[PDB]
Each structure stands twice: as structure tokens, then as C-alpha cells.
Amino acid sequence: SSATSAFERMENKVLDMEATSQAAGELAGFGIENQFAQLEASSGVEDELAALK
Amino acid sequence: SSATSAFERMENKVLDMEATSQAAGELAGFGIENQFAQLEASSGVEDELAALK
Amino acid sequence: SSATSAFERMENKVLDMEATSQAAGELAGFGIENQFAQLEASSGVEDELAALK
Amino acid sequence: AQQRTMSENLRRNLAALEAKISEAKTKKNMLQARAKAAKANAELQQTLGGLGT
Amino acid sequence: AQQRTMSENLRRNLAALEAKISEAKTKKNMLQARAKAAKANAELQQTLGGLGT
Amino acid sequence: RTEQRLNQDTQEAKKWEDRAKLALTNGEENLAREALARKKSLTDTAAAYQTQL
Amino acid sequence: ALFDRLGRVVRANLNDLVSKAEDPEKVLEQAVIDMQEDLVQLRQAVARTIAEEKRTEQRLNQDTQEAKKWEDRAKLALTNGEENLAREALARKKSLTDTAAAYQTQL
Amino acid sequence: ALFDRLGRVVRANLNDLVSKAEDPEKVLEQAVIDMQEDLVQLRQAVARTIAEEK
Amino acid sequence: ALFDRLGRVVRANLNDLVSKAEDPEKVLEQAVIDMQEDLVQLRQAVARTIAEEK
Amino acid sequence: RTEQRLNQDTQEAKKWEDRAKLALTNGEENLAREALARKKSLTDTAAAYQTQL
């Protein structure tokens, strides 16, 4: 019932919430890396096009 | 209990309806294909006439 | 009961409606190609008449 | 390591359920189509026949 | 650095969610138009068809 | 009244043939067959009317 | 079946009684109304089954192009050195290939 | 089956009775109105389809 | 187990009855609203994260 | 009314005819074809009115 313990309790609850969100998403259909890689590489070639011109 | 065994029954009940319907067709006599094949051939004679014109 | 599922449900219902309309028409007396071919060819010869003149 | 080993099975467990759901979604649509198709044949057969009564 | 790392997970996923909602919103509009088209078409096939008294 | 109906079928049959000829000239072979099948149907209908007359 | 015979007379007389009310210029005209009603219902049923055949055709093609989009990422990832991402993409492509097959057969 | 035949017989006469009560000028005109009403709705749909297109 | 099956059977029909009562234009639009409402809250969180960052 | 409609249409088909010759001469083929589709339609409708007259 102390502030230190009270603080610690609320903090861990929140960290489990952040995970809850990550997990809940993974199962649902998430990731967002696939596209990111394609955009990164393509953006690469854009820099190349910018340098050419 | 109710579950992957509710489906069981329903899928069977649908299949029984299809099976009964097919049997009814056999037992009444099939006029369908008798009309159809003869109709198509009848047209096929007239393809030559249409082509010639 | 989710938006994604709710959305998907209403979408498929509509696609079956679009088909419902196409089918309902086919049986009723539809097609509208017969005339279209004749108009396309005839419109061809019109372009020819336009080019001549 | 203990949690991660349990977690591997939990990921595999969920995916196995999703596979059954994948089967079920396809089965549903076909069972709806089959039931409707079967009825039209039965309706036609009664319309074709009837007997002296 | 932690703040930037966590705000970077959030901005990426915000960007992903934004696009996915917007896909749905633009589909919502055209799907309504599609629905109206189907509704009008069916009514017309019925009215125009002679398969009625 | 039978005499009115009868003649119509005779000219409707011609309109189908005309499309059958065009379609075969163009390369639209599928459309030609449907037209010929319908023409044969009108020919039977007219015959039946003539006899009835 | 002496009782059955008495009930038979009741049936026979009822059939006759009804056939008195059968007119020679009305029942025929109706018998042909009913047939139009039979036809309309059937058409609608046929159309609603043709509808799902087309609907399956829509779903089917999508899977075929979705499978390509996964491969494209698999190629990129392998070119870059992102080997982990490539496998997940290939596994998903194989899943879509099966889904499309199932749809084609269903079609 | 005689009962069902009785019902059909009754419905038939009723079909004729109301058929007799129609007059062509009115029913024929009324049919065209129906075709027009339906068309207007089909057009609206063409209206939305075009607006989303734009 | 027959009792539980009875309940499932009742719930099924009720699921259909209310499904039948929906109309696509309304439900589809209503879904987009929900997605929008949710997004606004997710943004707010991005708002705080940024402010603490500053 | 039939007389006016028949002629009230023809003359319009003509204007479309002139428009088609200008569209062709100026360099507008796709425009000319459209006007000709419009001409052609008024022409087909005009025959229908002629017989009806």
C-alpha cells in the first residue's frame, strides 16, 4: 500500500498492457515489415534517381 | 455437446437433400439431356448455312 | 460484431446482390450484345463514310 | 527460456485452430449454395409431376 | 533515445493503421453505389420481365 | 389475333440470322450459335401458329 | 374395411361436388397463372446460385495476385540479406496457393 | 388433394373477377408509370457511380 | 447435451433474425465511423508521447 | 406526333452527320465516331417511327 510498491504495481500492469497490445496484434494480423523493406529499398533507388538528376 | 459436432449433423443434412434430389431425377426419368444434345446439333446444321451466307 | 467483420459481411451481401441482379436478368430475358455487335460494325462503316466524305 | 518454450507451442496451437476455421469458412459458402441448388431441382420435379390429385 | 524508439514504433503503426482505414473509407463509398445499382437492376428485371401476371 | 402473332415470329427469325451472319464474318462465333438456336425456336413457334390459324 | 368403404363414398362424392364447381372457362386460365408464379420463383433460385459461382471467381483471383506480392518481398529480402523475412513470405505464399486451388476446384 | 383443388378453384374465380374489373386504358397507362418510376431509381444509381468516379 | 444444443439452436435463429434486419448501406458506413473513432484515440496517445519527448 | 418525332429526329441525325464530317476533317476521329453513334441511333429509331407511321 506504499507509494513505491503502489507505483511499481501500476508500472508492471502497464508493461503487460503494452505487451497485450503487441500480442493481440500479432494474432490478429500484423507485422508491418514486409512493405517497410520494400519502401526502404525503393527509397534507396529514389536517392539514386535524385543524385543522377 | 455443442461444437465441431453441431456442424457434423448440418453438413450431413444438406448432403442428404442433394442425394434425394438426384435420385428423384433418375426415377422420374431424365428428359433434360435428351432435349439439350439434340437442340445443339440442330443449331450445328444451321452454322454451315450462316457461314455460307 | 467487429468493424472489419461487419464491413466484410455487408460487402459480400452486396456482391451477391450484384450477381442476384445479373442472374435475375439472364433468366428474365437479357443479354444486350446482339444489337451491340450490329451497332459496332455499322458504326465502323459510318467512320468509313465519314472518311470518304 | 521456460516461457519462450511454452510460447512456441501457444503460437502453434492458435494456428491449428485457424486452419479449422479456414476449412469451415469454405464449407459454409458451399453448403448454402448446395442447399439452394437442391431445392430448385425438387421444386421443378413437383411442378413437372403431381399425379391425379 | 527510449522516447524516440517508442514514438517510432507508434508513428509506424499509426501510419499503417491510417492507410488501412482509408482503404476501407474509399471502398465504403463505391460499395454503396454498387448496392444501389443492384437494387435498381433487380427491380427493373422484374418489372420488365414477362415472367409475371 | 393468331395471324398477328404468327407473322411477327417470321420476321424476328430473320433478325437473329442477320446477327448470325455478322458474328461469323467478324469472328464472334459464340454469339452466332445463340442466335441460330433462338431462330430455330421462333421457326417452331411460327409453325405452331400457322397450324393453329 | 367396411368403415373404409363408407369413408370412400364420402371421398368420391366430395370429388364430384368439387368438380361441379370446376367451371369450363376459369380453372384453365388460372392453372396457367400458377405456372408463371412457379417459373419466377425458380428463376430467382437459379440466379442466386449463379451469384455465388461468380463470387468464388472474385475471391480466387485475388489469392493468385496476393501470392505474387509475397514472392516479390521474398526476392528482395534474399537480395538484401534479410533472410528471416523471406521465409515467412514464402510460407504465406504457399498458403495462398492452396487457398486459390481450393477456390478453383470449388468454382 | 380435393381440398387443395377447392382452394385453387376459389382463387381462380377471384382472379377472374378482379381481371374483369380492370379497364385497359387505365391499367396500360398505370404500367408505363411503373416502368418510369423504376427507371428514375436506376438512374440515381448511375448518378452515384459517376460522382465516386469523379 | 441435448439441452445445450437447444440453446445453440435458439441463439442461431436469433443471430439470423437480427442479421436479416441490417441493411448494408447503414452498417458499412457505421463500421467506418467506428474505425475513425478508434483512430482519433490512437492519435491522442501519439500526441502525449511527442509532448513528453519535447 | 409520330410525324414530328420521325422528322424531329432525322434532322438531328443530320446535324450529327455534319459534326462527324467536321470532327473527321479537323482531326477528331474518336469524336467523329461518337457523333456517328449518335447519328446511327437516331437513324435506327427513325426507321422504327417510319414503319409505325
Side-chain angles (χ1 to χ4, degrees):
Chain A
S1 72
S2 48
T4 296
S5 174
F7 190 102
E8 286 174 298
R9 285 169 64 253
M10 296 305 117
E11 172 171 4
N12 300 350
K13 178 165 176 180
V14 168
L15 294 164
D16 302 358
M17 284 301 304
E18 177 174 357
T20 293
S21 306
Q22 182 53 53
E26 282 171 299
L27 304 190
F30 200 75
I32 303 179
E33 254 188 24
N34 283 113
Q35 189 52 249
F36 183 73
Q38 303 311 264
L39 290 170
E40 178 172 63
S42 292
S43 184
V45 177
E46 291 300 300
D47 309 328
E48 177 56 58
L49 289 163
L52 176 56
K53 295 180 298 182
Chain B
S1 210
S2 231
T4 307
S5 304
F7 199 85
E8 284 185 57
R9 302 156 69 93
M10 303 304 100
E11 172 173 0
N12 280 225
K13 287 177 65 172
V14 173
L15 293 163
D16 294 334
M17 293 188 290
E18 290 189 289
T20 299
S21 296
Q22 292 170 73
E26 293 172 1
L27 197 51
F30 286 119
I32 306 300
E33 302 170 295
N34 295 340
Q35 299 326 108
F36 180 71
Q38 305 297 262
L39 182 57
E40 177 174 297
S42 294
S43 187
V45 178
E46 307 180 307
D47 296 358
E48 301 174 294
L49 307 177
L52 190 58
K53 293 301 303 300
Chain C
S1 72
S2 48
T4 296
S5 174
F7 190 102
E8 286 174 298
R9 285 169 64 253
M10 296 305 117
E11 172 171 4
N12 300 350
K13 178 165 176 180
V14 168
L15 294 164
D16 302 358
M17 284 301 304
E18 177 174 357
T20 293
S21 306
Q22 182 53 53
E26 282 171 299
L27 304 190
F30 200 75
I32 303 179
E33 254 188 24
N34 283 113
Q35 189 52 249
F36 183 74
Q38 303 311 264
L39 290 170
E40 178 173 63
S42 292
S43 184
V45 177
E46 291 300 300
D47 309 328
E48 177 56 58
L49 289 163
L52 176 56
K53 295 180 298 182
Chain D
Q2 166 54 26
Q3 290 305 305
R4 178 169 293 130
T5 48
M6 295 295 99
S7 293
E8 194 266 355
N9 305 323
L10 291 168
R11 291 185 181 196
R12 295 196 301 181
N13 290 148
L14 184 69
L17 186 52
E18 296 173 64
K20 292 188 62 176
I21 289 168
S22 300
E23 294 180 296
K25 288 290 175 61
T26 52
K27 185 55 55 58
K28 192 170 84 146
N29 302 128
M30 63 180 91
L31 291 174
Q32 292 313 293
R34 290 164 187 277
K36 296 170 192 300
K39 287 179 297 181
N41 284 244
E43 288 168 3
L44 178 58
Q45 293 329 285
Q46 174 51 38
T47 300
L48 292 171
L51 270 191
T53 327
Chain E
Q2 294 170 247
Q3 298 327 110
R4 289 289 177 177
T5 295
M6 178 58 179
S7 64
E8 175 272 304
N9 301 340
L10 294 172
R11 283 178 284 100
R12 289 296 184 283
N13 296 357
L14 175 59
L17 285 182
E18 165 49 28
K20 186 182 300 182
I21 293 169
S22 63
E23 180 179 298
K25 178 198 170 176
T26 51
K27 287 174 61 179
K28 180 261 293 176
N29 306 342
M30 67 185 76
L31 281 166
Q32 291 174 294
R34 288 166 181 173
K36 293 177 189 303
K39 169 172 57 176
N41 287 345
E43 290 174 62
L44 279 163
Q45 299 322 294
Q46 291 170 250
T47 299
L48 272 308
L51 201 44
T53 57
Chain F
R1 286 286 298 106
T2 47
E3 190 168 66
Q4 295 170 49
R5 301 163 192 165
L6 166 55
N7 278 344
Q8 295 316 113
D9 299 338
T10 63
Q11 54 181 289
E12 288 301 302
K14 297 175 67 283
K15 298 175 184 181
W16 294 104
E17 165 210 65
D18 298 342
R19 301 184 280 258
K21 274 195 233 130
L22 176 116
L24 294 174
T25 57
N26 297 347
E28 298 172 351
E29 61 180 63
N30 306 123
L31 192 274
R33 302 186 183 87
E34 298 176 296
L36 293 166
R38 288 302 311 283
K39 178 173 64 64
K40 216 283 298 189
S41 187
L42 286 160
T43 302
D44 301 346
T45 310
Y49 281 122
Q50 253 312 355
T51 60
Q52 187 46 230
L53 184 58
Chain G
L2 303 181
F3 183 65
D4 301 349
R5 302 314 74 180
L6 186 142
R8 184 172 296 251
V9 176
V10 176
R11 289 180 293 176
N13 189 19
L14 286 165
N15 175 46
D16 185 45
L17 180 58
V18 170
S19 187
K20 302 311 188 186
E22 291 184 304
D23 200 79
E25 235 173 296
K26 302 188 174 63
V27 174
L28 193 277
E29 165 132 354
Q30 169 67 55
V32 175
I33 304 300
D34 300 345
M35 296 170 188
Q36 304 323 289
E37 299 181 69
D38 296 347
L39 189 65
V40 188
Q41 296 323 293
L42 184 56
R43 192 161 299 162
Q44 295 315 294
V46 172
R48 288 175 295 201
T49 307
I50 292 165
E52 285 288 297
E53 169 206 57
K54 261 164 86 156
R55 286 286 298 106
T56 47
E57 190 168 66
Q58 295 170 49
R59 301 163 192 165
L60 166 55
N61 278 344
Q62 295 316 113
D63 299 338
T64 63
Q65 54 181 289
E66 288 301 302
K68 297 175 67 283
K69 298 175 184 181
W70 294 104
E71 165 210 65
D72 298 342
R73 301 184 280 258
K75 274 195 233 130
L76 176 116
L78 294 174
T79 57
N80 297 347
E82 298 172 351
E83 61 180 63
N84 306 123
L85 192 274
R87 302 186 183 87
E88 298 176 296
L90 293 166
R92 288 302 311 283
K93 178 173 64 64
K94 216 283 298 189
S95 187
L96 286 160
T97 302
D98 301 346
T99 310
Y103 281 122
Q104 253 312 355
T105 60
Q106 187 46 230
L107 184 58
Chain H
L2 307 171
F3 180 69
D4 297 351
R5 176 161 287 141
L6 185 57
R8 295 184 302 121
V9 165
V10 169
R11 282 173 274 199
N13 312 338
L14 290 167
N15 279 31
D16 296 354
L17 180 57
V18 69
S19 290
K20 287 162 184 177
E22 292 175 298
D23 174 46
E25 307 297 74
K26 311 179 188 175
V27 172
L28 194 72
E29 183 172 324
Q30 184 60 75
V32 172
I33 292 168
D34 300 349
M35 299 177 179
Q36 208 127 113
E37 290 175 299
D38 297 323
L39 197 55
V40 178
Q41 309 314 305
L42 167 60
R43 282 180 169 154
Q44 283 180 76
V46 177
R48 188 170 287 204
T49 306
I50 291 172
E52 298 323 313
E53 149 188 296
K54 290 170 175 174
Chain I
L2 307 171
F3 180 69
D4 297 351
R5 176 161 287 141
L6 185 57
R8 295 184 302 121
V9 165
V10 169
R11 282 173 274 199
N13 312 338
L14 290 167
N15 279 31
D16 296 354
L17 180 57
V18 69
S19 290
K20 287 162 184 177
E22 292 175 298
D23 174 46
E25 307 297 74
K26 311 179 188 175
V27 172
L28 194 72
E29 183 172 324
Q30 184 60 75
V32 172
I33 292 168
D34 300 349
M35 299 177 179
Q36 208 127 113
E37 290 175 299
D38 297 323
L39 197 55
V40 178
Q41 309 314 305
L42 167 60
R43 282 180 169 154
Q44 283 180 76
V46 177
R48 188 170 287 204
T49 306
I50 291 172
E52 298 323 313
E53 149 188 296
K54 290 170 175 174
Chain J
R1 297 183 185 89
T2 304
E3 290 180 290
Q4 303 174 305
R5 291 160 186 166
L6 169 59
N7 312 21
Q8 223 170 314
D9 266 2
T10 302
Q11 295 169 253
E12 285 169 63
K14 282 306 278 195
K15 291 189 287 185
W16 292 111
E17 182 183 306
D18 298 347
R19 288 158 174 180
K21 291 166 172 176
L22 291 165
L24 265 204
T25 70
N26 295 346
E28 300 176 346
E29 183 157 68
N30 301 277
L31 179 58
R33 303 203 177 196
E34 174 58 58
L36 294 159
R38 294 275 64 77
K39 172 189 174 185
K40 174 61 184 183
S41 295
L42 294 186
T43 294
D44 189 12
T45 295
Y49 286 131
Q50 250 169 20
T51 64
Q52 174 187 122
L53 184 57

